[PDB]
């Protein structure tokens, strides 16, 4: 059973840490201008800010 759990055991790279910050990436459709993207942000922002 020792050998039993060793194998059932899911393996990872490393424990992730909450670092006090993170990032959110913004991609729009193609050909779209910044204003489009820009509005997204205040949306993004407004989520965070609020």
């Amino acid at each position: 059973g020792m050998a039993y759990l060793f194998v059932r055991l899911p393996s990872s790279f490393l424990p992730d840490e909450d670092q006090g910050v993170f990032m959110t990436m913004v991609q729009l459709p193609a050909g779209a201008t910044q204003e489009r993207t820009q509005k997204v942000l205040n949306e993004v922002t407004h989520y965070y800010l609020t």
């Binding site: 729009l28 459709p29 193609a30 050909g31 779209a32 489009r36």
Partner: protein, 86 residues
Amino acid sequence: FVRARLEEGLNPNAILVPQQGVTRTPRGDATVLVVGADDKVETRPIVASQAIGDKWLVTEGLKAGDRVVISGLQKVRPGVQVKAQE
């Protein structure tokens, strides 16, 4: 020689699609995403006419009352159901 804007044909009926919602396909072919009553997005190929304003005049392929599926280019792959906003 001063700029002269000279009035012209004044198109009686213009299909003006926001150049947002205007996505060519196939190569150089305006594909409007307008979703019919089925609310299953169906991109209907057309050819945007000469660019104007922020929108495309498109001589053909679209009709009046067509709800342009303009944005949402992620949540809409063709055929998917969709809830319109205008």
